[PDB]
Amino acid sequence: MLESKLINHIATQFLDGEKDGLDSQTPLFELNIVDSAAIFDLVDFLRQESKVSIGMQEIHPANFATVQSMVALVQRLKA
Amino acid sequence: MKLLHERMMHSLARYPRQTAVVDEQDALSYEALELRIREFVAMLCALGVGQGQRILLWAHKSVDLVAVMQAALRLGVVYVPVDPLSPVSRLEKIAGDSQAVLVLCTAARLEELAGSALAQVRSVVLDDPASAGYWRNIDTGSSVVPTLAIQPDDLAYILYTSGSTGVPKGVALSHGNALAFVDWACERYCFQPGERFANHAPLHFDLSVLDIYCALNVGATVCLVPESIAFSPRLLTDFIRQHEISIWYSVPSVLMMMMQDGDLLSDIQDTLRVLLFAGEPFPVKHLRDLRAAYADVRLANLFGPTETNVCTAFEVGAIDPERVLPVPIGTAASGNQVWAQKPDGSRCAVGEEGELVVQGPTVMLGYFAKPAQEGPYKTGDMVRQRPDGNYEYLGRRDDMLKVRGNRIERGEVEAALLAHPQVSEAAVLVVGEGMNAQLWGVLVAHTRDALSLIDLKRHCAQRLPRYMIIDKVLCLDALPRNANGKVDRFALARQVEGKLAAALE
Numbered sequence: 208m209l210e211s212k213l214i215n216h217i218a219t220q221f222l223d224g225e226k227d228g229l230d231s232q233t234p235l236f237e238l239n240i241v242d243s244a245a246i247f248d249l250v251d252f253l254r255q256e257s258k259v260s261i262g263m264q265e266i267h268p269a270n271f272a273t274v275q276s277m278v279a280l281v282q283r284l285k286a
Numbered sequence: 287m288k289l290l291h292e293r294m295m296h297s298l299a300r301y302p303r304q305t306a307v308v309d310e311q312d313a314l315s316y317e318a319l320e321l322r323i324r325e326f327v328a329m330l331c332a333l334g335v336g337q338g339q340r341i342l343l344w345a346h347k348s349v350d351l352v353a354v355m356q357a358a359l360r361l362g363v364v365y366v367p368v369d370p371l372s373p374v375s376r377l378e379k380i381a382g383d384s385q386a387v388l389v390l391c392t393a394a395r396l397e398e399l400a401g402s403a404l405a406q407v408r409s410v411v412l413d414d415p416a417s418a419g420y421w422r423n424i425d426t427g428s429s430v431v432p433t434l435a436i437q438p439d440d441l442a443y444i445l446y447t448s449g450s451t452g453v454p455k456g457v458a459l460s461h462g463n464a465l466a467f468v469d470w471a472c473e474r475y476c477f478q479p480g481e482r483f484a485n486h487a488p489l490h491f492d493l494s495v496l497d498i499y500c501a502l503n504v505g506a507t508v509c510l511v512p513e514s515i516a517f518s519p520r521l522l523t524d525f526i527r528q529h530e531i532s533i534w535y536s537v538p539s540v541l542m543m544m545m546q547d548g549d550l551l552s553d554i555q556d557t558l559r560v561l562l563f564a565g566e567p568f569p570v571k572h573l574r575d576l577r578a579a580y581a582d583v584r585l586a587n588l589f590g591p592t593e594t595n596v597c598t599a600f601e602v603g604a605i606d607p608e609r610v611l612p613v614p615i616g617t618a619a620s621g622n623q624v625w626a627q628k629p630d631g632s633r634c635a636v637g638e639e640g641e642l643v644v645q646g647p648t649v650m651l652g653y654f655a656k657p658a659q660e661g662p663y664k665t666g667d668m669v670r671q672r673p674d675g676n677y678e679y680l681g682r683r684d685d686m687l688k689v690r691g692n693r694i695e696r697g698e699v700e701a702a703l704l705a706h707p708q709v710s711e712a713a714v715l716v717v718g719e720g721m722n723a724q725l726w727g728v729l730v731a732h733t734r735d736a737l738s739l740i741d742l743k744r745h746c747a748q749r750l751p752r753y754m755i756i757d758k759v760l761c762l763d764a765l766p767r768n769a770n771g772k773v774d775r776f777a778l779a780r781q782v783e784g785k786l787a788a789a790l791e
């Protein structure tokens with residue numbers, strides 16, 4: 208269940224553990240939850256938790272805009 | 287040749303079949319850009335936009351935007367670049383300050399403008415041919431192009447900066463302001479015909495002045511970096527190779543992402559000839575690695591506020607193994623004179639800390655719709671001169687902040703935060719250096735202690751660009767002030783105590 212591990216991870220890493228308003232559809236960059244410089248700290252969590260290697264062509268902003276985008280990526284990158 | 291728009295005409299006359307500007311969709315020869323410029327000149331006339339009037343460019347960079355700029359310059363029309371990702375409310379404040387008579391934007395963002403305070407300002411759509419407002423649908427049949435008397439110190443464009451009150455401040459820049467910098471850069475770095483410039487910075491930051499206007503000044507090519515490619519550091523560095531980029535200009539943070547994840551130090555980009563950085567301290571550990579991989583590249587630290595563009599520059603030689611402090615900012619640039627001032631107004635001795643003061647041709651006309659700048663410009667940047675004459679940057683004393691090169695007034699953010707119904711008082715400060723810098727909000731809550739960091743970020747997102755939204759918040763019952771209301775800056779001790787407490791567990 209990828210959504211649960213990302214919603215949880217994002218709150219502790221970037222919201223100091225406050226999961227109050229975060230969900231799979233909240234825009235992470237428009238809200239400065241995830242900045243320019245924490246983009247790979249997220250890709251690094253998706254390589255360990257999901258166990259799939261992320262490519263350069265797929266480090267697109269649309270894939271990481273939301274949790275629903277990142278989960279769709281791992282489903283996509285799995286088959 | 288004392289006017290900006292005359293520079294590309296000179297290059298067009300020399301190099302008509304040479305590639306002038308490149309984006310994702312199109313790649314325009316100088317002749318094709320000329321034709322495009324003439325369409326926008328005809329458009330602006332057909333709309334009755336006259337000499338002196340302001341227009342907002344609220345759209346992502348493209349060849350059309352470059353053509354718009356040249357067209358507006360030819361008509362003495364002052365163009366005003368606005369962050370396409372900026373919220374309508376901030377666009378509102380800028381439209382009011384400039385009194386723009388025209389907004390150029392995508393069709394997507396017309397909808398937000400209908401409910402805005404600039405619903406009555408004329409708008410044209412740049413992207414979607416299906417819009418009635420599509421710029422090409424404006425009938426240019428009866429348009430007639432006038433002949434104008436434009437002086438080199440007439441206002442050319444306005445670049446808005448963060449404002450201490452919440453209203454952005456417009457740096458009003460003349461033809462002479464831009465050309466002093468452009469000519470200085472072209473002579474110092476010997477930009478040549480047919481070189482390829484990368485335009486990484488958005489058009490509303492003055493780094494794009496070099497990327498675009500130096501390229502059109504020497505008959506070279508400007509390659510516009512799209513946001514989709516700017517976001518994969520591995521794609522940024524592949525961008526350099528595919529377009530055979532030879533001049534690069536960015537804040538250090540961009541170069542560091544390309545080093546960390548773009549293979550910039552291992553997959554050597556050997557077409558690079560000049561590698562300029564500006565806007566912030568380039569961590570010397572990382573500059574050391576960059577200089578070792580690109581040992582034969584012209585590599586330079588450029589300095590200055592938007593109010594002056596680059597007023598000081600330093601050619602980077604070697605990086606001493608033992609160096610801990612950032613490289614100097616150097617000596618005066620762009621035809622200016624530079625010195626460090628004591629508060630008494632006198633010139634500092636070597637070693638004395640003082641405020642950088644700039645006098646010369648890149649000094650702005652002044653803030654738009656505000657009284658003209660007279661005399662030397664006090665920058666607010668504290669500096670110290672080394673025995674060798676080069677200046678070193680020390681930081682600021684005022685409330686201007688920097689996060690990864692982005693200029694942020696504490697008061698702009700505080701104003702958005704204080705407007706929240708539950709926030710009583712607010713202080714903003716940056717904690718951490720470089721890529722670890724974080725924007726903190728220190729607040730006083732009216733009731734309870736229940737303030738959602740996400741609710742605070744949505745509230746900020748309605749007023750501020752994303753990089754101005756607070757990363758972290760700290761709620762306490764009182765803000766520490768000196769006897770006359772100045773925030774004690776001991777909040778940094780309070781924040782450091784919070785962060786350390788979390789590491790302890």
Ligand SMILES: *P(=O)(=O)O[C]C([C])([C])[C]([O])C(=O)[N][C][C]C(=O)[N][C][C]S[C]([C]S(=O)(=O)[N][C][C]1O[C](N2[C]=NC3=C([N])N=[C]N=C32)[C]([O])[C]1[O])[C]1[C][C][C][N]1
Nearest residue numbers: 243539564565566567588589590591592595690691692693
């Ligand atoms: P992400 O979305 O958080 O990361 C992505 C990225 C690209 C890093 C993003 O954050 C970004 O786009 N960065 C924006 C930075 C940028 O594009 N440039 C802004 C122009 S910087 C400066 C004008 S200024 O007024 O904005 N800043 C003036 C101010 O800056 C300080 N300063 C200038 N130059 C230096 C140097 N060399 N060293 C230290 N400090 C420096 C001074 O305090 C100065 O007063 C430009 C730079 C050249 C001319 N003006």
